[PDB]
Symmetry: C3
């Protein structure tokens, strides 16, 4: 009896795990995730980079990072307003790196940017037309997270 009950429960667990994964798939789809593409999403809340990072991490994602022009446009249409990207030049000034590791491949800087103005600007925001502007990490911008393809 006990070995049988346990086996049956193990089967119920497998089914439940698959059903949750399905729920996750349907949700991503409803929010616009394209086949074979990363899922970008926002709650339209503006906050400092430290909070965006903590927030996306809490949902098991990361701050949105455009790896090419196509993902840049995707993040642009999701954000609507100015949003932080998971890129900073905190280690060596001018050397932008992804918060998940590695040197910057694709970039879409605005005219006269990055300019590290004032006391300094080590974070990055995607703004109007999808162009980039380095900004203070302490400034508040829209939180956009990315989840794997």
């Amino acid at each position: 009896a006990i070995e049988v009950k346990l086996a049956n429960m193990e089967a119920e667990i497998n089914t439940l795990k698959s059903k949750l994964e399905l729920t996750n798939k349907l949700h991503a789809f409803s929010m616009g995730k394209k086949s074979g593409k990363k899922f970008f999403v926002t709650n339209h809340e503006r906050m400092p980079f430290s909070k965006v990072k903590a927030l996306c991490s809490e949902l098991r994602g990361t701050v949105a990072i455009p790896r090419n022009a196509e993902e840049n446009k995707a993040i642009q249409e999701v954000a609507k307003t100015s949003a932080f990207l998971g890129i900073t030049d905190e280690v060596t000034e001018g050397q932008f790196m992804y918060v998940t590791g590695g040197r910057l491949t694709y970039s879409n800087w605005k005219k006269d940017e990055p300019n590290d103005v004032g006391s300094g600007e080590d974070c990055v925001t995607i703004v109007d037309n999808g162009l980039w502007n380095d900004i203070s990490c302490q400034a508040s911008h829209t939180a956009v997270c990315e989840f794997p393809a």
Copy 2:
């Protein structure tokens, strides 16, 4: 070994619990939930107050209640059209109360409202410009639910 399988099952259940909690958090975030703020959702369906209550209750939420101007604006944006609020004077005519209990504090009544017109109006709808009007609970208005912060 029975005991080893039971321990694995405890681990599988805990993992499931944590992933479902994550699914709930990601969904709220995608629906616009701001940090430390309750969030609002609607399917844009219009129905009598009693139905809205049942529906929200069934989702472990409650008909939306504006506790301040920010929340009121947020509800207004989600709704898009006239929607019921979790406020009524059903228990004692003239004394509006929250469906979850307590006398109404913050309010945003249109001029000359509430007016309990006709045979009476004991429900409340957020309408044009986000102002409020008491209306018959039997009329159909947009169902908007609120969930905890």
Copy 3:
């Protein structure tokens, strides 16, 4: 110990099942699901019919099929642009059938359609009028999946 823990885990599993059902209801409501009505969802991606069937199949739904004018309008509004319907005449030219099986009840063909132009047209797209046109299954149109009422 053994038996008590097993009984607890059974209640844990049942509790999880109820919670996930709850999450699915909340998600459906946010996706726009109207009471007792089937609902349509899209990620706004355009792709060939085969990829639409595959994508909807993964999510345990089916390619959208309008059964009457009301459902046909619902699909139109969700898609916004041309979208494939779960209808084709791939089996027998001239004879449209549902992908779920069966001959065509409701139809909303644009004048002179279906015409199987040029090399051939075995799929159907609901256009920007709500009307239908048979088109190549290899063409890319918006993916709209359907879930039960």
